[PDB]
């Protein structure tokens, strides 16, 4: 047929609309089945059956969320040391000790920093070096 | 010795190829259904 | 002309004095803005006096404050414009009610007492 | 031990309160009404708690005949009605017309399928009669609750326009009258009727009562419910004051404030 | 652990979104999570058990 | 080729023809914008309903949109067939075809999800219990110990966090042009690098409590043989998922959960 041939029927039907509706057009600027239910029922049935089977299983592990959260909240540190400041102090004290092979205060300060933050093996090695 | 007075240098040193600094190989209840 | 129910209405001279004192109180941190906060100050008994705007649109939203002030023995006045009251309070929005609170050893005590005496004579 | 004891004590208390409520309803056509209104409001909570313990008792007793029914029917009244309708004979899911008045067809299918393979045993006649009397007690308590709610709804045009009539009555009763309500800050009215709700805090809604749990506030996404509460409370306060002087009896102020609230909600949700 | 399993399932059930479209993926895994590899390998182990038979 | 242009022009001419003169001097551009909006809404798979738009014009727009959608789908499929079979093309045509294919695939995926919701699970309870029993039997035969929740003082958490952050960072073959989301993710990874313990506590908190998440953004890598879906996730959830992934894989290897025949293995 044609494009306008297809649209002629609806053009005629559009011819009926009145002038009041013509000029009032807005602008773009502005029983049944609950199909879900049956799926929910089937899901619940499967889940209940699977939990029924799981009841036999024993060795599973599950922690108590409130207990673990309480433990974490307790474990939150109250001091420690800002990491950027700690790294700045580490570089500073490294330069100090390297410049002065004979500053026991410098070696003690470096060891104190390395033991308050981080681990202790590095502090032990640095302090053997400082002692010698 | 108190040894008051200290000089400190900041450098972007410690650049390496990511290999070991020395060429050494540094080496170091169950489930049940009832 | 304004509203018969805003009975103790101040005049232009007393209005100017009241707005100046409210500005000073705001500068001294002795002012509370809003009907809710005025009610809270009245309940806590820390209010020197209450100033309300006479052009509140329903005007029944702040008519509990005169009764509260009578119960707690606090003076109160009505001004004509809420825009002026809001400007004097330090904000750009209109304000319909504000309260001047009590501060120990403040330097505004004499002016507050004079304004209280002036207000108390308007209830005739 | 104290099952029948608590049942009888609640029966007496509900008898007194329902006599008062029915007297007030009949009289519809110094001992104020808001006192009995708040009494009914707390009796509703008492009835709910008693219904909860009765539901627990029924669950424990019936968990030997049809242990799996509790999962399929989580609602309390529905579960009680289902156990009453099924009884000892689980062959009543076939061609049953009463069960269709309590549950949907999907859950009816599920319960019929599960009953065919349940591994439960029969209950003794004494246990059956105990369950029946417990169910009847629960049903009569529910009827009393319905009567209380009817009276509570039947019992300030603007404040009622903004928020229903039940919530208005609740807040005015807890406040202690319209005059007492009119002279409170909005931030205090927002908190009228708020529990403590022990943790076992964000998941508890610490500061919410009688306005947060309202039809117009719960009608929003959760993330917008606190703000809405504030707003509603604010406007409610204004309405209350306008009501305390018996002005705008037609509800014009209430309609205007409700329109403003709706506009704010729309703008929030656009 | 039960909490970890719940977390993984909830993660896999989320809302996809393109430039303008979006839906709620609820059937299959999203395949773009960091543990999708573990999920796929475990499911494949289950499939292996089905195919081979426990004895073999 | 230009069937869409012809269709739009014909639709415009038809709507303007009978439209009265007195108001067409004003409403022509408005109706054109309406056509564009309807087409955009159809493309995005979202409702389009103008309350004040008369029903005959609504029907006209609907017919236009239906015809244009038919042509759109057909031409997208044909162009994909051409490119796949092998035919010289250019960047703009390839990109346009990729966008069209992405939209069509997303429509199909939404249909799939809704059909799943309607038809419920395809696994019968009997099959589910069968596979569950088989799995528990295998695990019991192996004596496998279920993986526990990471303890507070687990030794290796720092190492696992470093590995996860390294894996996340490696995703940047620097082009000098990184979007806001990618830059923010990089900043978050650097912050985690800086402070390990706070991020670890956050991760444990999320693993233990979070059950409602944001959305993910899906795009399609264009291999002419077949498109590949590519998912982007929120940076914080990315961090948490990476940590959980590393932890799960390490512990599964430790317990030897996966038999040797599961491939690819790490040693080959």
From Swiss-Prot, chain A:
Identified in the spliceosome B complex. Identified in the spliceosome C complex. Associates with the U5 snRNP particle. Component of the U4/U6-U5 tri-snRNP complex composed of the U4, U6 and U5 snRNAs and at least PRPF3, PRPF4, PRPF6, PRPF8, PRPF31, SNRNP200, TXNL4A, SNRNP40, DDX23, CD2BP2, PPIH, SNU13, EFTUD2, SART1 and USP39, LSm proteins LSm2-8 and Sm proteins. Interacts with ARAF. Interacts with AR and NR3C1, but not ESR1, independently of the presence of hormones. Interacts with USH1G. The modification Phosphoserine is found at residues 8, 74. This is Pre-mRNA-processing factor 6. Widely expressed. It is found in: Nucleus, Nucleoplasm; Nucleus speckle. It comes from Homo sapiens. Involved in pre-mRNA splicing as component of the U4/U6-U5 tri-snRNP complex, one of the building blocks of the spliceosome. Enhances dihydrotestosterone-induced transactivation activity of AR, as well as dexamethasone-induced transactivation activity of NR3C1, but does not affect estrogen-induced transactivation. The chain holds residues 136 to 337 of 941 of the full protein. The modification Phosphothreonine is found at residues 61, 70. Phosphorylated by PRP4K during spliceosome assembly. The gene is PRPF6.
UniProtKB/Swiss-Prot annotation, chain B:
Widely expressed. It is found in: Nucleus. It is linked to Retinitis pigmentosa 33: A retinal dystrophy belonging to the group of pigmentary retinopathies. Retinitis pigmentosa is characterized by retinal pigment deposits visible on fundus examination and primary loss of rod photoreceptor cells followed by secondary loss of cone photoreceptors. Patients typically have night vision blindness and loss of midperipheral visual field. As their condition progresses, they lose their far peripheral visual field and eventually central vision as well. Belongs to the helicase family. SKI2 subfamily. Contains two helicase domains. The N-terminal helicase domain has catalytic activity by itself, contrary to the C-terminal helicase domain that may have a regulatory role and enhance the activity of the first helicase domain. This is U5 small nuclear ribonucleoprotein 200 kDa helicase. It comes from Homo sapiens (Human).
UniProtKB/Swiss-Prot annotation, chain D:
Residues 156-270 form the Nop domain. Keywords: Acetylation, Coiled coil, Disease variant, Isopeptide bond, mRNA processing, mRNA splicing, Nucleus, Phosphoprotein, Retinitis pigmentosa, Ribonucleoprotein, RNA-binding, Spliceosome, Ubl conjugation. It comes from the Eukaryota. One of its GO terms (molecular function) is U4 snRNA binding. The record marks 187 as: Interaction with U4 snRNA. The keyword Phosphoprotein applies. The record marks 207, 230, 235 as: Interaction with U4 snRNA and U4atac snRNA. It is found in: Nucleus; Nucleus speckle; Nucleus, Cajal body. The record marks 226 as: Interaction with U4atac snRNA. Ubiquitously expressed. GO terms for biological process: mRNA splicing, via spliceosome; ribonucleoprotein complex localization; spliceosomal tri-snRNP complex assembly. Phosphorylated by PRP4K during spliceosome assembly. Residues 30-64, 125-155 form a coiled coil. GO terms for cellular component: Cajal body; MLL1 complex; nuclear speck; nucleoplasm; nucleus; precatalytic spliceosome; spliceosomal tri-snRNP complex; U2-type precatalytic spliceosome. It is linked to Retinitis pigmentosa 11: A retinal dystrophy belonging to the group of pigmentary retinopathies. Retinitis pigmentosa is characterized by retinal pigment deposits visible on fundus examination and primary loss of rod photoreceptor cells followed by secondary loss of cone photoreceptors. Patients typically have night vision blindness and loss of midperipheral visual field. As their condition progresses, they lose their far peripheral visual field and eventually central vision as well. Belongs to the PRP31 family. Interacts with the snRNP via the Nop domain. The gene is PRPF31.
From Swiss-Prot, chain E:
The MPN (JAB/Mov34) domain mediates interaction with TSSC4 and SNRNP200. Has structural similarity with deubiquitinating enzymes, but lacks the residues that would bind the catalytic metal ion. It is linked to Retinitis pigmentosa 13: A retinal dystrophy belonging to the group of pigmentary retinopathies. Retinitis pigmentosa is characterized by retinal pigment deposits visible on fundus examination and primary loss of rod photoreceptor cells followed by secondary loss of cone photoreceptors. Patients typically have night vision blindness and loss of midperipheral visual field. As their condition progresses, they lose their far peripheral visual field and eventually central vision as well. This is Pre-mRNA-processing-splicing factor 8. Widely expressed. The chain holds residues 1002 to 1057 of 2335 of the full protein. The gene is PRPF8. It is found in: Nucleus; Nucleus speckle.
């Amino acid at each position: 047929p044609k494009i306008q041939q297809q649209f002629s029927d609806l053009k005629r039907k559009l011819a009926e609309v009145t002038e009041e509706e013509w000029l009032s057009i807005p602008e773009v600027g502005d029983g049944e089945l609950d199909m879900r239910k049956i799926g929910q029922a089937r899901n619940t049935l499967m889940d209940m059956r699977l939990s029924q089977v799981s009841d036999s299983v024993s060795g599973q592990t599950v922690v108590d969320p409130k207990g673990y959260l309480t433990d974490l909240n307790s474990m939150i540190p109250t001091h420690g040391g800002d990491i950027n400041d700690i790294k700045k102090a580490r570089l500073l004290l490294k330069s100090v000790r390297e410049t002065n092979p004979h500053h026991p205060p410098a070696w003690i300060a470096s060891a104190r920093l390395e033991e308050v933050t981080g681990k202790l093996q590095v502090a032990r090695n640095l302090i053997m070096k400082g002692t010698e | 010795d108190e040894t008051y007075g200290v000089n400190v240098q900041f450098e972007s040193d410690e650049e390496e190829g990511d290999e070991d600094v020395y060429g050494e190989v540094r080496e170091e209840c169950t489930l049940s259904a009832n | 002309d304004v509203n018969p129910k805003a009975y103790p209405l101040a005049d232009a001279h007393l209005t100017k004095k009241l707005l100046d004192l409210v500005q000073q109180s705001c500068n001294y941190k002795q002012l509370r803005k809003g009907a809710n906060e005025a009610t809270k100050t009245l309940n806590r008994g820390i209010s020197e006096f209450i100033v309300m705007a006479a052009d509140a649109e329903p005007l029944e939203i702040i008519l509990h404050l005169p009764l509260l002030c009578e119960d707690k023995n606090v003076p109160y006045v009505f001004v004509r414009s809420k825009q002026a009251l809001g400007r004097a309070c330090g904000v750009s929005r209109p304000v319909i009610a504000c309260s001047v609170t009590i501060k120990e050893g403040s330097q505004l005590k004499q002016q507050i007492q004079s304004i209280q005496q002036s207000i108390e004579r308007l209830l005739v | 031990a104290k099952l029948w004891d608590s049942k009888m004590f609640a029966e007496i208390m509900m008898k007194i309160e329902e006599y008062i409520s029915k007297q007030a309803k009949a009289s519809e056509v110094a001992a104020p009404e808001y006192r009995v209104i708040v009494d009914a409001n707390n009796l509703t909570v008492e009835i709910e708690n008693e219904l909860n313990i009765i539901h627990k008792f029924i669950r424990d007793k019936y968990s030997k005949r049809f242990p799996e029914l509790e999962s399929l029917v989580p609602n309390a009244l529905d579960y009680i009605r289902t156990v009453k309708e099924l009884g000892n004979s689980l062959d009543k899911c076939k061609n049953n017309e009463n069960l269709q008045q309590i549950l949907t067809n999907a859950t009816i299918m599920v319960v019929s399928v599960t009953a065919s393979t349940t591994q439960g045993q029969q209950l003794s006649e004494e246990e059956l009669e105990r369950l029946e009397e417990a169910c009847d007690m629960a049903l009569e308590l529910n009827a009393s609750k319905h009567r209380i709610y009817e009276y509570v709804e039947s019992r300030a045009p603007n404040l009622s326009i903004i928020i229903g009539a039940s919530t208005a009555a609740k807040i005015m009763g807890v406040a202690g009258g319209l005059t007492n309500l009119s002279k409170m800050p909005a931030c205090n009215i927002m908190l009228l009727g708020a529990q403590r709700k022990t943790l076992s805090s964000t998941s508890v809604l610490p500061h919410t009562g009688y306005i947060y749990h309202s039809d117009i506030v719960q009608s929003l996404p959760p993330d917008l419910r606190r703000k809405a509460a504030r707003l509603v409370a604010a406007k409610c306060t204004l309405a209350a004051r306008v009501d305390s002087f018996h002005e705008s009896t037609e509800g014009k102020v209430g309609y205007e404030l409700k329109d403003e609230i709706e506009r704010k909600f729309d703008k929030w949700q656009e | 652990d039960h909490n970890i399993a719940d977390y993984m399932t909830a993660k896999n059930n989320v809302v996809i979104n393109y430039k303008d479209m979006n839906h709620t993926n609820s059937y299959g895994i999203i395949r773009g999570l960091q543990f999708a590899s573990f999920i796929v390998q475990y499911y494949g182990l289950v499939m292996d058990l089905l195919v081979l038979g426990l004895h073999r | 080729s230009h069937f869409d242009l012809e269709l739009r022009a014909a639709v415009m001419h038809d709507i303007l023809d009978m439209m009265p003169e007195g108001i067409k001097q004003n409403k022509a551009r408005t109706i054109l914008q309406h056509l564009s909006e309807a087409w955009r809404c159809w493309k995005a798979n979202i409702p389009w309903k103008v309350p004040g738009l008369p029903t005959p014009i609504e029907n006209m727009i609907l017919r236009y949109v239906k015809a244009k959608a038919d042509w759109w789908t057909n031409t997208a499929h044909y162009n994909r067939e051409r490119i796949r079979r092998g035919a010289t093309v250019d960047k703009t045509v390839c990109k346009k075809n990729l966008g069209r294919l992405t939209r069509l695939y997303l429509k199909a995926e939404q249909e799939r999800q809704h059909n799943y919701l309607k038809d419920g699970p395809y696994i019968t309870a009997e099959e589910a219990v069968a596979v569950y029993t088989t799995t528990v039997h295998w695990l019991e035969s192996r004596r496998f110990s279920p993986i526990p929740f990471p303890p507070l003082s687990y030794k290796h958490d720092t190492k696992l966090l470093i590995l996860a952050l390294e894996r996340l960072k490696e995703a940047y073959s620097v082009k000098s042009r990184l979007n806001q989301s990618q830059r923010e993710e990089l900043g978050l990874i650097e912050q985690a690098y800086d402070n390990p313990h706070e991020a670890l506590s956050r991760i444990k908190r999320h693993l233990l409590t979070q059950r409602a998440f944001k959305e993910v953004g899906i795009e399609f890598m264009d291999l002419y043989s077949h498109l590949v879906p590519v998912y982007d996730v929120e940076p914080l959830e990315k961090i948490t998922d990476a940590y959980l992934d590393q932890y799960l894989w390490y512990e599964a290897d430790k317990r030897r959960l996966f038999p040797p025949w599961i491939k690819p293995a790490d040693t080959e």
